[PDB]
Amino acid sequence: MEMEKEFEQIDKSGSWAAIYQDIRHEASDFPSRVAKLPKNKNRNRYRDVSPFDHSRIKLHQEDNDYINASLIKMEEAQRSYILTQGPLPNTVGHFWEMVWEQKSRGVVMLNRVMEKGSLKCAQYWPQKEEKEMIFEDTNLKLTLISEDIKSYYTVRQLELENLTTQETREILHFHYTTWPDFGVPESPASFLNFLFKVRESGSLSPEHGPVVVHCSAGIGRSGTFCLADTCLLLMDKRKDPSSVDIKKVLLEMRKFRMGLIQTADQLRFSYLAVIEGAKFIMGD
Ligand SMILES: O=C1NC[C@H]2CCN(C(=O)OCc3ccccc3)CC[C@H]12
Fold it and tell me: How far apart are CA 76 and CA 237, in angstroms?
């Protein structure tokens, strides 16, 4: 059923809360035993948001391999994402170790360091060229190379150096800075242009490791980003784009990380985003 007609039917009936609860009821439940070990308590921002054991990213070290991050592998779309929590003061070194070990080109950040007057993640990248950051626990150096500040987002070029081998790589930081404190954006136009700019960079392409995506918990905004990306890609691949079922794609993605899409308003925004994105590719 053409998802726009499905959209108008749920709007006119006001049944977004009912649709969302049905997804919550059908979603996969897999064990998260490593996340709940006592040694990992200070590695988790939220007690109720944990990676499944089968899809968790493992750090390459014998001491403690744990990070709150999941590999979302979308087989038909041929896209992979790592979804992770905003880094904590004691996990910033782990975060950059993961970027290095997974060969990621891009980091997508969908939150502000401070929102609603509280800290939603650590200040994990350098703010000035001449003040680099050293992570002694993982033996990495991070330098700001350049910064481009636009009205709805900021792009930064970073250099990550493995101090063990003296290899260096360029990482692109894509920072969406205007997600409102309450609810979701009124129009999806600035969000869709942000995805297109991430795509344009090469960060989502198969010649690199998976893109690293985060918000505060790594399920809400983060879920919206990868759901919209994957749905639009399937519409360009499938003989009949009308066959793309956003609820079925969300359930597939929830096999790899719990809780993706946190509210019925986030669900409606994802639809809205996918509906408006299809008109620029297929319509005019
Ligand atoms: O701001 C803009 N004006 C022209 C547009 C050209 C590329 N854009 C696009 O394809 O539209 C939505 C979308 C984004 C990703 C995938 C499918 C559809 C992003 C917005 C751009």
Answer: 9
User: Rounded to an integer, what distance in angstroms lies between the CA atom of residue 36 and that of residue 208?
Assistant: 31
| Helix, coil or strand: residue 284 | coil
Domains contained in the chain, number: 1
CATH number at residue 132: 3.90.190.10
CA distance 53 to 199: 29
Report which of 223, 213, 225, 216 is spatially closest to residue 88, judged by C-alpha positions. Answer: 216
Q: How far apart are CA 159 and CA 27, in angstroms?
A: 39
Q: 260 CA to middle of ligand 1, Å?
A: 23
Cα(280) to ligand 1 centroid in Å equals: 7
Smallest CA separation from ligand 1 atom 12, residue = 277
Q: Give the resolution to one decimal, in Å.
A: 1.8
What six digits make up the tokens of 137? 């626990």
* Cα-to-centroid distance, 189 and ligand 1 (Å): 8
Active-site residues, by number, are 215
Pocket of ligand 1 (CB under 6 A): 192-193, 195-196, 232, 277, 280-281
Task: Label residue 139 left, alpha or beta by phi (over 0 means left) and psi (-120 to 50 means alpha).
Answer: left
The residue whose CA is least distant from atom 5 of ligand 1 is 193
Domain that holds residue 219: 1-283
Q: How far is CA 13 from the centre of its chain?
A: 31
Beta strands in 196-259 (DSSP E): 211-214
Please give the full DSSP string across 249-272, using - where no structure is assigned. Answer: HHHHHTTTSTT-S-SHHHHHHHHH
